[PDB]
Amino acid sequence: KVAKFVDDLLEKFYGLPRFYNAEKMEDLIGHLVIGLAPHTSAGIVGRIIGFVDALVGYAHPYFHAAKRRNCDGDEDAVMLLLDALLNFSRYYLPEKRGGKMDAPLVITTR
Amino acid sequence: EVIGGRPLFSDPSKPGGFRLRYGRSRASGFATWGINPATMILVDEFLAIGTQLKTERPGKGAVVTPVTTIEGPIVKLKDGSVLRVDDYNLALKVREDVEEILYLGDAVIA
Amino acid sequence: KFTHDTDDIALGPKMSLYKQLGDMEEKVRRQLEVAKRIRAVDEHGVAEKILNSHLIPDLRGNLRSFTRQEFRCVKCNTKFRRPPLNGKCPVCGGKIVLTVSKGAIEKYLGTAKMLVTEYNVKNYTRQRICLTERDIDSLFENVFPETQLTLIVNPNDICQRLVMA
Amino acid sequence: ERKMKPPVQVLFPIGLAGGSSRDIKKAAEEGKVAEVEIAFFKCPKCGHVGPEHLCPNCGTRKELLWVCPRCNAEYPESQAEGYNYTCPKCNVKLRPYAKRKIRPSELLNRAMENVKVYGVDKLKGVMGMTSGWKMPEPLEKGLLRAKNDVYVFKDGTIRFDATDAP
Amino acid sequence: EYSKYEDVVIEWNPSVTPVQIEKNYEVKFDVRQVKLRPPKVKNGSGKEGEIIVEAYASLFKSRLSKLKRILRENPEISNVVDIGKLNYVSGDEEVTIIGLVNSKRETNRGLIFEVEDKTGIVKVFLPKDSEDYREAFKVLPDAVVAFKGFYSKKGIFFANKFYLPDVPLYRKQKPPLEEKVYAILISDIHVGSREFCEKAFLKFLEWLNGHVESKEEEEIVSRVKYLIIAGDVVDGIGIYPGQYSDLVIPDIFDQYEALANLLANVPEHITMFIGPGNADAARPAIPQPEFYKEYAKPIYKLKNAIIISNPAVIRLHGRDFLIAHGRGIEDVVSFVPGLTHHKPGLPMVELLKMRHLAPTFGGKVPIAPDPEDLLVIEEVPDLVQMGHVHVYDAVVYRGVQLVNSATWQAQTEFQKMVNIVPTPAKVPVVDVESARVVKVLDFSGWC
Amino acid sequence: PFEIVFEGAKEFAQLIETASRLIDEAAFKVTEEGISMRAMDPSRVVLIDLNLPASIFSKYEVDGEETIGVNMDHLKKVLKRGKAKETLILRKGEENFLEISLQGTATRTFKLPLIDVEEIEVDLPELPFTAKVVILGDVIKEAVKDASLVSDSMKFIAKENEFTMRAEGETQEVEVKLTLEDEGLLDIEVQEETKSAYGISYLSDMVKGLGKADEVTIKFGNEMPMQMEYYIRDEGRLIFLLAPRV
Amino acid sequence: PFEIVFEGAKEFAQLIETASRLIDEAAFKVTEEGISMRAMDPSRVVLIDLNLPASIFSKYEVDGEETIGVNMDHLKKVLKRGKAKETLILRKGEENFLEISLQGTATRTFKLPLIDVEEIEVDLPELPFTAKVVILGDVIKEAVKDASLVSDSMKFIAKENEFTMRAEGETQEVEVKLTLEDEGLLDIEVQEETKSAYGISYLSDMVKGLGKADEVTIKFGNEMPMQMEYYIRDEGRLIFLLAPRV
Amino acid sequence: EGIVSAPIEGIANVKIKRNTWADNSEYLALYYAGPIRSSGGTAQALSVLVGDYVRRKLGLDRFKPSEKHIERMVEEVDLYHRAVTRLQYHPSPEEVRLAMRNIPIEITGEATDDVEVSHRDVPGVETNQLRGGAILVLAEGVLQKAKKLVKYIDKMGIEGWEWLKE
DNA sequence: ACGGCTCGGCCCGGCG
DNA sequence: CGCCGGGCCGAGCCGTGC
Ligand SMILES: [Mg+2]
Ligand SMILES: [Mg+2]
Ligand SMILES: [Mg+2]
Ligand SMILES: [Zn+2]
Ligand SMILES: [Zn+2]
Ligand SMILES: [Zn+2]
């Protein structure tokens, strides 16, 4: 659904060619995401290669360590890279202390 | 403390609880345990892939992951027979006749 | 590298049973059968006493907060530290509702009484539960008097049995 | 998936016109007028005013309006830059927002005509914005989110939460 | 270790002969004596959520009406006008308003109030240069006060005088008594606790039986007739988390049995009046009609024990005694600055001046949803007794004594944590005729 | 392996619903003569029993006696799917399932599981009733509906040739008075003046679902429970026992 | 001490319910010629006058003029219990209680407490109304129900032998045109073209529950309050005065 | 490593204060906001260490609290556990006194809880309510993570922290 | 320790 | 044509000694 929304946004709002062109979840393989922890301000880029029938997020221990997570009950968020690139803005962040937590202010590429 | 609805699987360092095995599976090692799916099935499916549990010896908290090479529970049936359920389909077939869980199974800790 | 191997990475139950139980009584009962099945748990009193320190805090905390609570208008969200003398919102025609209802106090009393009667706990917890029920009954003496009789008495309750002993 | 405490599909303030659920479409269809604090942008050429980044008449990027708190003089961004974001006639720092009245009917009709999305039943917004800028979001994005059944977060992203395993 | 004072027997000394005196006494107020008619729903299909609100509103209405009737006694207050019909008055007239204090704040000019009554709310300002500013500063909300001043059509009621229900300055002395009679006050025994000072209590019980050194104390003992206990006679069950390790007797039945066995040793010529407290098996919120009978039966069965309520008023030889536990002192201590638990006699005077025993709603005291307020001091007493503080004090304010009997429980972990120094084993001795404290016994040597 | 055929499934659905209005679980005792039911609501305030002999059943065939337990919610939900003219059929094979079938313009069979419920014998012995009255369903129904307007309780007063039922509120009052010369009452037999009071909720729950052309008999005494009866198809009988107030 | 007997309690219930949709508390005056009524909407935008002369009532007797003050909600709840063929009796005695008795198959009596309410007597004489028209209830009912969809404000236009109702919105629009040849338009009398607008909510309240075969008189002027009146039983009548919006 | 937002949002402000009651010297105070409450034990202790190093490198003196400051801190630590959260750690009062006496900077902050204190109008402290950010730093920072802190001190060539080593 | 538990209001379908 | 009743939605709240 997120990819369909992104394609509709690209075709109807900006007038640009569609990007994902996916009809099933197996068509998202090879596309990039961003992983962010609920207490940090930097994200990391990951790639999709497969799916499982469980309710967990499998990844390398380096991937979970790079988000300062311990992997003993923690939970993190994932978002498509292009959706975040188009949609994120620093003018929607709350003004009180704590509005910059959970924000991709910078992303690591390696 | 025990919250209503959240079971307690073993008493501190009590024989018959979780058997300690030293090792690391394909999908475990950071802070997670390795558990046979048979002992997930035979505890009324209160344990699922990714369910957290508060541990005693190594740390405080872990996530369970299926390992099919370690041993499973030993159960006592309603007619008096004693069986070793190291398989998943066998547990599914036998679940309804279980009178007492003699042994709980193994846990692989890194 | 790795030490142990597994046939499948997503083999086994996929959803916890805790998410498929609605009532608190059903949750407690299922958890207690689970604890009874396992040989190395010793539910019979241990799980009750440890579990009773999750319902007793709720009961006593709700009972305490009932007598010092703030009221609010349904139409607005303005809160009043003291009930209005007119019974209605001064800046509305809307009616005043409580923030701690009477049914939010005694929602776990049935399960607590079941846990007390079906298992052997220390006399301290049993007396605490009996006194909690007595206090709940006594706080609402002049507001909700007992005006309805019943056909049969003695529903196998434990408080009167302890008192008569 | 992740949703706010009241679910939100567009970061647009509605106040009380939308009801308990902050439904923008219901307020638009009932002809209600709402007063909220937002940022208004002004077209340098023709002088359009409203909470839009692009002028519908000519398609030329507008500029943010700065307003005095006590005094009520509006200064565009280019002029407010010279004034150091302080009112000349007063001695109080300027602000990019003020309490203003909006009519959801015209805005929603323009958005629907813009993205060609008409059959949407609900469109939830916020009671008020939390930033210091109070810059709103385009309503076309909210319509496309409502059409595809996806939600939004505090920074304008769609997120999915899951337990992590190695 | 489960001894419950089963074999604690003290016999009267056959050396001191008590003087024959006719016990003239009668209970003047009891909570389980006013018949509170429960409320009727506005229609035939009501629910629980509305009756409670209506009962609370009725309670506050009754409080306001009773305190207004008390206020309209002094000749100085006159020309009362309703708050609702205040816009229909001139700007050059002397008017008064009586209502409940919603909230108060402080500014450079003075104090701003939100006095409210049955017919709407109004804002009242009092200048800092007023003569009653000091008195009105240390007032806590939900009390009933009277104001005097000029009402402005702008929206502020400017005032120049402050009033409280107070106590009359002049009173008529009572006729003298024929023979002298004495009374003893006790509170906060806390039977069943590890910190309960049992040896001092036993020594005091022997003192009541004639084991006395000085001749004047012999005469006082021979003249003792009445004894009053102001609650907290047992340590309770489940008062706070972690109490199980603090209890020698972890059984409420056994606690009351031990207390009855202790109190059975009083002489047969003394009448005991016992009231409940915040640790006993009784109603969670004040007023408490009595103990739970099925738990306090061993103390109900005593030959000369009389069970009273909280609060209750007793009339011994024409002298009125107002007996309460004293949970309302905490509100005065925590509001007014400069007041501590080490000197509880001043918050007692504050409560007496405001003529209510627990005004603040939503603080440190629980208030029951009764349709009638029984915590208003309707009549002026001769003596006032309180406990719950574990510190002794005694002052006199305009002819009424304000005692605070000490505890019988040594300092425990909590009072050590929060810096309170108890004074256990102190017992006031009062004179019935004078209605004043004439001596203080101190049995703290053993405890 | 017993076959049951019932004409007018709507009536059966209505009686099942009026039995379900108070209790949630019950067990049916069916013998060669007929089928019977009896249980009590968890508040221990009301008692309902029901009998259905072989005469009213158009086709009866049963071997021995069997105790069956059915979820009353699912039972009434299935029964509500019938029509006014279809014939209701109840069958049970060797499996522990109840086969509920309806035969109108088409035949539909519902499979519904059997449940086990503990059966407790609870019979209150016949008590000395000082008054009896026979009235129509319509009059008592409207009287209950009016009494629910002012108060949550309704008061009965019995006297020779005078049967009055009232309810007082805080300010308002409603009184229903009628005699032998009126229409709603058929006959009245009292031995002494009688007075009682009963909750509005229970009375409204029990009288709801009665036909206008029906005869209901009320037996009650002084500060003692009340019994309400009404014949079903001239052969059955319904017993309601309600505790009084005060 | 007056005794008033009325037939067809349903009609009285409808009349009171129509009178109860704008006001909650008001006073009733009773006099030899009949019963009057004049209440005021709390919003001070719609005026209601109701007059019930004595001839309509079957047995109407009273001496002098008295005032009666009753809350409308309780009264509407009491009268809503009446059926199509129940006799409605209004009786008052020395005691300050209003007795409403419903005579039928069972004599059920209600008692209501009178409440003191202030009376503001403002008699409005004939105003210069540019247009006076008479239409059936169904036509105006359907017109209002159609106009409720598009917007919340309804426009009236009266021209020479023409009656047009219109409502406008952001994008939608509905119009209704009435001519003499139409059955709904009985007659029309206008001196010059007039136009004004009103609110749908108040209009819906005044026209809802209007009989199909009723001739309704409409009088209004340029940006002036509208006068609506329809006769009941050919003897009593109700007058509505709705102030225009903007 | 520049990942978690402790530097960005944990540290509300930095100010230079004067030790008027004792010697009128110059010291440094760190204001801790709400978000520092969820940064982990290691981030807070390193923040205190960095504050100490910067105050020593800027030629500033050390904090010299009065007794009232100590009593206020002990009652705040006692109160927050009783009324807000379990603290995940319970320092003894003597440990609190030792830490307050031997820390060269003032660990303070704004008010985050709607609870009033007993020791009021303490000089230098501008609030009479619980300061959750600072007390959590003290409890779960230099105290709970003392071993890692002393290891960092040894690796870092920092003196003046012998009391923590003892 | 915080998602789970009570209330109240507001439309939307049947249903008679 | 007018109710009865469900099913959503949104508010609030969760041990404690003087
Ligand atoms: Mg972790
Ligand atoms: Mg006490
Ligand atoms: Mg005490
Ligand atoms: Zn309101
Ligand atoms: Zn432009
Ligand atoms: Zn300006």
Query: If you measure from the C-alpha of residue D80 to the centroid of ligand 6, how many angstroms do you get, rounded to a whole number?
Result: 12
Closest residue on chain F to C151 (Cα): F45
Residue E276 structure tokens: 């409940």
**DSSP string for D51-81:** S-SB-TTT--B-EEEEE-SSS--EEEHHHHH
Angle at which helix G137-150 crosses helix G200-207, to 10 degrees, equals 150
Q: In chain B, what is the greatest distance between 2 CA atoms, to the nearest angstrom?
A: 42
Distance CA C8, CA F141 (A): 67
Distance CA H43, CA H5 (A): 10
Under DSSP, is residue F72 helix (H, G, I), strand (E, B) or coil? helix
Count Cβ atoms below 10 Å from residue G57 Cβ, excluding itself.
19
Q: Which residues pair with E256 in a beta bridge?
A: none
Length reported for chain D: 166
Pick the ligand that lies closest to the CA of residue C72. 4
Distance CA F177, CA E57 (A): 38
Residues with Cβ within 8 Å of C118's Cβ and at least 6 positions away in sequence, in order, are none
- Give residues whose Cβ lies within 5 Å of ion ligand 5: D 43, 46, 48, 55, 57-58
Per-residue burial over G140-163, b = 16 or more CB atoms within 10 Å of its CB, e = otherwise: bbebbeebbebbbbbbbbbeeeeb
Task: Find the Cα–Cα–Cα–Cα dihedral B2, B4, B8, B12, rounded to 10°.
Answer: 20
Distance CA E434, CA F188 (A): 73
- Please name the amino acid found at residue E307: I
Contact between residue E283 and residue C139 where contact means Cβ atoms under 8 Å apart: yes
Contact between residue H86 and residue H138 where contact means Cβ atoms under 8 Å apart: no
Distance CA D98, CA B80 (A): 79
Nearest to G176 by CA among G145, G152, G219: G145
A42 Cβ under 8 Å from any chain H Cβ: yes
Pick the ligand that lies closest to the CA of residue H40. 1
Query: If you measure from the C-alpha of residue D73 to the centroid of ligand 6, how many angstroms do you get, rounded to a whole number?
Result: 6
Q: Do C34 and B7 touch (CB under 8 A)?
A: yes
Q: What residues in A contact H31, CB-CB < 8 Å?
A: none
Query: What's the per-residue H, E or C state across chain E?
Result: CCCCCCCCCCCCCCCCCCCCCCCCEEEEECHHHCCCCCCCCCCCCCCHHHHHHHHHHHHHHHHHHHHHHHHCCCCCCCCECCCHHHCCCCCCCCEEEEEECCCEEECCCEEEECCEECCEECCEEEECCCCCHHHHHCCCCCCEEEEEEEECCCCCEEEEEEECCCCCCCCCCCCCCCCCCEEEEECCCCECECCECHHHHHHHHHHHCCCCCCHHHHHHHHCEEEEEECCCCECCCCCCCCCHHHECCCCHHHHHHHHHHHHCCCCCCCEEEECCCCCCCECCCECECCECHHHHHHHHCCCCEEECCECEEEEECCEEEEECCCCCHHHHHHHCCCCCCCCCHHHHHHHHHHCECCCCCCCCCCECCCCCCCCECCCCCCEEEECCCCCCEEEEECCEEEEECCCCECCCHHHHHCCCCCCCCEEEEEECCCCEEEEEEECCCCC
SS3 content of chain H, % helix, strand, coil (to 5): 50, 15, 40
Distance CA G30, CA G34 (A): 6
Length reported for chain F: 246
Contact between residue G196 and residue G172 where contact means Cβ atoms under 8 Å apart: no
Could you tell me the distance in Å between the CA of residue A75 and the C1' of nucleotide I2?
16
Distance CA G210, CA G218 (A): 14
Experimental method used, please? cryo-EM
Q: Which residues pair with C72 in a beta bridge?
A: C79, C97
Distance CA F139, CA F211 (A): 11
Domains located in chain F, CATH noted: 1-246 (3.70.10.10)
Contact between residue F47 and residue F120 where contact means Cβ atoms under 8 Å apart: no
Contact between residue D163 and residue D62 where contact means Cβ atoms under 8 Å apart: no
Whole-Å CA distances, F129 to F133, F189, G246, H108: 11, 10, 71, 81
Nearest protein residue to nucleotide J12 (CA to C1' distance) is C99
Contact between residue G155 and residue G174 where contact means Cβ atoms under 8 Å apart: no
Distance CA E59, CA G201 (A): 41
Closest residue on chain B to D166 (Cα): B27
Closest residue on chain D to A12 (Cα): D115
Nearest to F156 by CA among F144, F166, F168, F146: F166
Q: Do A40 and H3 touch (CB under 8 A)?
A: yes
State the chains in contact with C (3 or more Cβ–Cβ pairs under 8 Å).
Answer: A, B, E, F
* Quoted resolution (Å): 2.9
Under DSSP, is residue F226 helix (H, G, I), strand (E, B) or coil? strand
Going across the sheet that includes E312-316, the strands are E25-29, E312-316, E319-323, E383-386, E400-404, E393-397
Q: Do E57 and C90 touch (CB under 8 A)?
A: no
Nearest to B38 by CA among F62, E254, B103, A70: B103
Contact between residue F78 and residue F110 where contact means Cβ atoms under 8 Å apart: yes
Q: Do G77 and F139 touch (CB under 8 A)?
A: no
DSSP-derived secondary structure letter, F125: P
Nearest to E262 by CA among E220, E305, E219: E305
Residue E426 structure tokens: 């102190």
Pick the residue of A79, A87, A92 with the most D CBs within 10 A to test the interface with D by mutation: A92
Going across the sheet that includes B82-84, the strands are B82-84, B74-77, B98-103
Contact between residue D126 and residue D23 where contact means Cβ atoms under 8 Å apart: no
Q: Which nucleotide is nearest to C95 (CA to C1')?
A: I8
Distance CA C1, CA H96 (A): 47
Q: Do A52 and C15 touch (CB under 8 A)?
A: no
Distance CA E63, CA E85 (A): 22
Per-residue burial over D94-122, b = 16 or more CB atoms within 10 Å of its CB, e = otherwise: bbbbbebebebbebbeebbeebebeebee
The whole-angstrom distance between D165's CA and the closest CA on chain B is 7
Nearest CB to F47 within list C147, C151, C155: C151
Residues with Cβ within 8 Å of G3's Cβ and at least 6 positions away in sequence, in order, are G59, G61, G89, G90, G91
CA G102 to chain CA centroid, Å, is 24
Q: Do A39 and H8 touch (CB under 8 A)?
A: no
Query: If you measure from the C-alpha of residue E339 to the centroid of ligand 6, how many angstroms do you get, rounded to a whole number?
Result: 50
**DSSP string for chain G:** --EEEEE-HHHHHHHHHHHTTT-SEEEEEEETTEEEEEEE-TTSSEEEEEEEETTSSSEEE--S-EEEEEEHHHHHHHHTT--TT-EEEEEE-SSSEEEEEEESSSEEEEEEE----------------SEEEEEEHHHHHHHHHHHHHH-SEEEEEEETTEEEEEEE-SS-EEEEEE-TTSSSEEEEEESS-EEEEEEHHHHHHHHTT--TT-EEEEEE-TT--EEEEEEETTTEEEEEEEPPP-
Under DSSP, is residue A81 helix (H, G, I), strand (E, B) or coil? helix
C155 Cβ under 8 Å from any chain F Cβ: yes
Nearest to E348 by CA among E402, E392, E422: E402
Contact between residue G124 and residue G157 where contact means Cβ atoms under 8 Å apart: no
Chain F span 63-82 residues with beta carbon within 7 Å of strand I: 80
Residues preceding chain discontinuities in chain D with C to N over 2.5 Å: none
Contact between residue E234 and residue E280 where contact means Cβ atoms under 8 Å apart: yes
Whole-Å CA distances, B42 to B32, B67, C15, E303, F155: 20, 15, 14, 64, 59
Residues of D with CB under 8 A from a CB of B: 163, 165-166
Gap between the terminal Cα atoms of chain B: 27
Under DSSP, is residue F220 helix (H, G, I), strand (E, B) or coil? strand
Residues with Cβ within 8 Å of E303's Cβ and at least 6 positions away in sequence, in order, are E268
Residue B75 structure tokens: 């159960």
Pick the ligand that lies closest to the CA of residue B59. 1
Distance CA H157, CA A64 (A): 32
Nearest CB to E40 within list F147, F149, F170: F170
Distance CA G64, CA G31 (A): 6
Q: What residues in F contact C152, CB-CB < 8 Å?
A: 40, 44, 122
Q: Which nucleotide is nearest to C100 (CA to C1')?
A: J13
D69 Cβ under 8 Å from any chain G Cβ: no
Contact between residue G239 and residue G18 where contact means Cβ atoms under 8 Å apart: no
Residue carrying structure tokens 């308990």: D20
Could you tell me the distance in Å between the CA of residue C99 and the C1' of nucleotide I6?
10
Nearest CB to C85 within list E39, E61, E284: E61
Distance CA G43, CA G153 (A): 17
The whole-angstrom distance between F236's CA and the closest CA on chain G is 28
Asked if the bond preceding E287 is cis, omega within 30° of 0, the reply is yes
Q: Do C131 and E64 touch (CB under 8 A)?
A: no
Going across the sheet that includes F185-190, the strands are F66-71, F25-30, F34-40, F46-53, F237-242, F226-230, F215-220, F131-136, F185-190
Is the C-beta of residue C103 closer than 7 Å to nucleic acid chain I?
Answer: yes
Nearest to B108 by CA among B60, B71, B75: B71
Q: Which of residues 75-104 of B touch C (CB under 8 A)?
A: 88, 98-104
Q: What residues in C contact F246, CB-CB < 8 Å?
A: 147, 149
Distance CA E427, CA E420 (A): 19
Number of H helices, E strands in chain F: 4, 18
Contact between residue E239 and residue E409 where contact means Cβ atoms under 8 Å apart: no
Residues with Cβ within 8 Å of A24's Cβ and at least 6 positions away in sequence, in order, are none
Query: If you measure from the C-alpha of residue B46 to the centroid of ligand 1, how many angstroms do you get, rounded to a whole number?
Result: 22
Asked if the bond preceding E311 is cis, omega within 30° of 0, the reply is yes
Count Cβ atoms below 10 Å from residue C153 Cβ, excluding itself.
9
**HSE on the CB side for A89, CA within 13 Å?**
14
F148 Cβ under 8 Å from any chain E Cβ: yes
Pick the residue of C144, C146, C151 with the most F CBs within 10 A to test the interface with F by mutation: C151
**HSE on the CB side for C151, CA within 13 Å?**
22
Distance CA E357, CA E332 (A): 11
Phi, psi of E167 (to 5 degrees): -130, 140
Distance CA G43, CA G201 (A): 13
State the chains in contact with F (3 or more Cβ–Cβ pairs under 8 Å).
Answer: C, E, G
Nearest to E140 by CA among E356, E436, E368: E356
DSSP-derived secondary structure letter, F190: E
Could you tell me the distance in Å between the CA of residue H106 and the C1' of nucleotide I3?
38
Is the C-beta of residue E412 closer than 7 Å to nucleic acid chain J?
Answer: yes
DSSP-derived secondary structure letter, F47: E
Q: Which helix (H) or strand (E) covers residue F34, if one does?
A: strand F34-40
Distance CA E355, CA E365 (A): 17
Distance CA E140, CA E332 (A): 8
Whole-Å CA distances, E149 to A89, E90, E159: 59, 12, 4
Contact between residue D126 and residue D34 where contact means Cβ atoms under 8 Å apart: no
Nearest CB to D145 within list A5, A64, A80: A5
Q: Which of residues 101-160 of F touch G (CB under 8 A)?
A: 138-139, 142-143, 145-146, 149
Residue A32 structure tokens: 């990039």
Distance CA D4, CA D154 (A): 8
- Please name the amino acid found at residue G111: K
Residue carrying structure tokens 């003499």: G180
Residue carrying structure tokens 């949803």: E369
Residue carrying structure tokens 């006399």: C123
DSSP-derived secondary structure letter, F185: E
Closest residue on chain C to B17 (Cα): C40
Closest residue on chain A to H8 (Cα): A100
**DSSP string for C14-78:** -S-GGGG--SHHHHHHHHHHHHHHBTTS-HHHHHHHHHHHHHHHHHHHHHHHHTS--EEESSS--
- Please name the amino acid found at residue E121: I
Q: Do F149 and E41 touch (CB under 8 A)?
A: no
Q: Do D144 and A13 touch (CB under 8 A)?
A: yes
